[PDB]
Amino acid sequence: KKKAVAVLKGNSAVEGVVTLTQEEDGPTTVNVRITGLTPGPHGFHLHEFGDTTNGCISTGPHFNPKGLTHGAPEDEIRHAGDLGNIVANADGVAEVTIVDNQIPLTGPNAVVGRAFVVHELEDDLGKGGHELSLSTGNAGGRLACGVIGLTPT
Amino acid sequence: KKKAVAVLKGNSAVEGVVTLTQEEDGPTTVNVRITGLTPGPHGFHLHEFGDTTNGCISTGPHFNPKGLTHGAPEDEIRHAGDLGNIVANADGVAEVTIVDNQIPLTGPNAVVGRAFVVHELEDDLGKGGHELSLSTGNAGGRLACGVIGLTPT
Amino acid sequence: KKKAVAVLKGNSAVEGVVTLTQEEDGPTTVNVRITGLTPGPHGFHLHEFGDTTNGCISTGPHFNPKGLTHGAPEDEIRHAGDLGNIVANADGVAEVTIVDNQIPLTGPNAVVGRAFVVHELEDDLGKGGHELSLSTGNAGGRLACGVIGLTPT
Amino acid sequence: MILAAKKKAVAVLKGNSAVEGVVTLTQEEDGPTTVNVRITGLTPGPHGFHLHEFGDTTNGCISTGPHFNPKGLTHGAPEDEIRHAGDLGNIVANADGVAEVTIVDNQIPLTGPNAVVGRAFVVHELEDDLGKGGHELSLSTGNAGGRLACGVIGLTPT
Amino acid sequence: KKKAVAVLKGNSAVEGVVTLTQEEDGPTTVNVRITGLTPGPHGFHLHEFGDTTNGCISTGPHFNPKGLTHGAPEDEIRHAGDLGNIVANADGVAEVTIVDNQIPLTGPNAVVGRAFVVHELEDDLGKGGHELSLSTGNAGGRLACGVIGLTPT
Amino acid sequence: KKKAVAVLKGNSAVEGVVTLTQEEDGPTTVNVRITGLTPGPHGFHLHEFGDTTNGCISTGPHFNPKGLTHGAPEDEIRHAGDLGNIVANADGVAEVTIVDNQIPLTGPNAVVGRAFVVHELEDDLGKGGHELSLSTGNAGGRLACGVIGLTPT
Ligand SMILES: [Zn+2]
Ligand SMILES: [Zn+2]
Ligand SMILES: [Zn+2]
Ligand SMILES: [Zn+2]
Ligand SMILES: [Zn+2]
Ligand SMILES: [Zn+2]
């Protein structure tokens, strides 16, 4: 019964739309459709801030209200916005639906007014082991981002 | 001390940045810098949805949780997002700072994940005696808009 | 064998890529892939100027070096930039490939450094009985545009 | 011209008689639907061919209901703007009892709000008199007789 | 409130009726009444295609939009159409009510226009260990099938 | 990406070569180069049969897997092999590139093993109104034809 949407833009052909649905105080369903991607897996994250005054750089780090480390969406040691990878087909198109419970549209940890970012490289899920594997996953640069806003229904 | 920001973009040269700063549950400070505007007063409103899948059109009507008619920011009978006019100088720049009490960053009426819209025309503050005066003003088309998102501090 | 590309952007979810191919003094082949569109036909035109200082507005009118009225790509009585309609499916995705002779990549009428615009409405092809049919084809507002640029191969 | 995702469905038409056949449907993107019909065992001559509302054969073909009619208009000819969506006119069976015809229509999409997937095809006993012919039943049915064979429109590969 | 029905027919005495009811976007309630069956358990699956051009064989493999291996309705690792076994009494009648969440009547994965097949042999769920166990369940031949079609109310 | 070719030969000096390209479930790109033609427009069609036992006469009518009438590539109450006109220059050369949806190289309506015919006269696109306007277009005799055959890469 609550809904949000993010329009994803950047400097390249990578652009897309992410819709969010949440019932009850339950899981959040995320419908992701992005194009222009290099075929393969891309880091896909909900970042802390809905600030685009400085391009996608101003969206900050992965949304992490539990001071925890970077992981996979399945394992209990992740950031709230650690939504893993989205995979682009041969046409650079990634269409996927993701269900997660650390990203509510309400409550103290609402991600409303926050951001989504799709990334340059594959998320190594915090096993790289890279220096950066445990903060970012190595997902690389920020290809496109958008601020999460309220939308009808 | 909570703070939010909206980056305003559109179909024209008109763009700008709006920052929001709020005390406790005190009044909200709205800092506006917009460029590309025709010199003169322009309707400046906080609209209901942080949706821009269809441009500024998807941000809906003026934010109105009291279900009242359109008027001026000083009026008793006003929309919450009815922030009146902002004035552009000869260089097309409207820089102004606004304080209002119906646009909190938290609570049952939070404006996070909603939008700002700068309009084609002067807002008649519903006294115009125009068909649209009591809903719109005659604020005209949507020159630029942005989703209100969270930002540090 | 020269090649060009335009990355199509705007204030909405409407995004796209246009690639252009032309050998010597032959026809020009245009691959158009746009997403985010309202399902149905949309005016798709090559406009005179590659200028986005004023959004898609500064790209001017349809590219028309033969001083003619608005028509269909098939009509001898068309603008050079009259590339007809592109049709979006139910998911809002329109992909189409077009061959034309009036939009070369070289010579006195090169379209390099000009722009592409995808439009709000159906192009009535100049046949709709409307005031705007012979200049634009109705087709409405400018959803997204991009400057046509040179690209390798 | 335009790139096209191919969408496809099929109905196998069976009934109490020798009348049986196969109907395939092709639609690219959201354009018109191409319908290929091959039915056998028919009485030579024209036969009513309609897309009926339900893919329900629990009670023989009669449970497929009336003609698919999401506009609410009366029975007419495929040519007529006075149509059921499923008003596909007549198929004519030759002397060997075979009716083979190809049809293009725009009121029978395989996707969308008016999807015909999971609905049915029915070939009928008699001639469809279209919205003409002046019978009590002409504006519902087309006085098209009984239901000889029917099938549920189902998904099929590619 | 959506409802569907499949009439199950085949080469032998095996015939039956399956009605499907689904409210909301949730579990599907499926009522199965099949007769002529051998007394004992028989595999009951929702197959991919509503194609019966070549008899029940044309219905394809078990409906599997998660590209996963054969399991039980209880396992988490199943085909969507993995609805387990139905057991026929000594009179050859199998009557059962079954509820599952992977067979919606609407959505990207609607099972409308697909089919049901009741099988020759017992479905070793996936975990019996045989050649075909992780594809079919060695459910054996296809005794009767029917295309899932729309029905009133 | 599949590719095909027709080598076009005939009764006169008229000869030419046609190559076909088709990716995916996309359009077919047809490259046409014919010589020996009288300057002007000439009907260019994909006819039904790849049979030249009796010269071009044995290639049959225009390829028409829809039950439709003769017309023009843009208007589509047309045959699949309705490719409009090709224009010969002063030197009798017609070089043209064509992209179409009704001539796939694969699938049930493949044009592989069928033929291309270049015709004596201009195609009237279905509009003489002439006896032949709705079947052939009054394209005249068959100047040269070739069977559409598979070619590497
Ligand atoms: Zn992280
Ligand atoms: Zn107002
Ligand atoms: Zn024009
Ligand atoms: Zn009817
Ligand atoms: Zn299975
Ligand atoms: Zn023809």
User: Where are chain B's structural domains?
Assistant: 1-153
* Dihedral angle, C-alpha C97, C99, C103, C104, nearest 10 °: 110
| Candidates A42, A78, A114, A142; catalytic one | A142
User: Which of the residues B8, B9, B11 would you substitute to probe the C interface, choosing the one with the greatest number of C C-beta atoms within 10 Å?
Assistant: B11
Angle at E76 between CA E75 and CA E77, to 5 degrees: 90
Chain A and chain B share a number of CB contacts under 8 A equal to 82
Query: By CA distance, what is F74's nearest residue in C?
Result: C74
Nearest to C40 by CA among C86, C78, C96: C86
Distance CA D27, CA D25 (A): 7
Concatenating the DSSP letter of every residue in E27-92 gives -EEEEEEEESPPSEEEEEEEES----EEEEGGG-SB--TT------TTSSS--TTEEEEEEE-TTS
Q: What's at F96, amino acid-wise? A: V
User: CA torsion B89→B95→B98→B104, rounded to 10°?
Assistant: 130
CB within 8 Å of B51: residues ≥ 6 apart: A5, A149, A150, A151, A152, B58, B59, B60, B115, B147
* F101 neighbourhood in chain D, CB within 8 Å: 1-2, 4, 28
The runs of H, that is alpha helices, within D47-96 are none
Q: How far apart are CA E140 and CA E128, in angstroms?
A: 14
**Residue B32's beta-bridge partner residues?**
B18, B96
Nearest CA in chain D to C86: D2
> Which stretches within chain F are classed as H helix?
none
Q: Measured between CB atoms, which of D1, D4, D5 is closest to F99?
A: D1
**Resolution for this PDB entry, in angstroms:** 2.6
Of E44, E143, E152, nearest to E98 by C-alpha is: E44
CA F76 to CA C126: how far, in whole Å?
Answer: 18
Distance B83 CA to ligand 2 centre (A): 8
Rounded Cα distance, A37 and A47, in Å = 19
Nearest to C118 by CA among C4, C13, C22: C13
> Ligand 1 centre and the CA of A35: distance in Å?
22
**B98 phi/psi in degrees, rounded to 5:** -125, 140
Whether C17 has its CB under 8 Å from any CB of chain A: the answer is yes
* Active-site pick, A42, A78, A114, A119: A119
Tokens, residue E125 = 């769920």
Looking at the annotation, which residues of D are catalytic?
A: 50, 52, 67, 75, 84, 87, 124, 147
Helix (H) or strand (E) holding F79: none
Token output for C46: 């090559």
CATH code that applies to domain E1-153: 2.60.40.200
Judged by CB atoms closer than 8 Å, whether chains meet at D103 and F67 is answered as: yes
In whole angstroms, give the CA distance from residue E111 to residue E96.
19
Residue B38 touches partner C, C-beta closer than 8 Å: no
Minimal Cβ distance to D102: which of F27, F67, F107: F67
Smallest Cα–Cα separation from A63: which of A147, A149, A152, A150? A147
**Which pair of tokens denotes residue B7?**
């980056």
| Chain B adjacent subunits, 3+ CB pairs under 8 A | A, C
Q: Is B42 a catalytic residue?
A: no
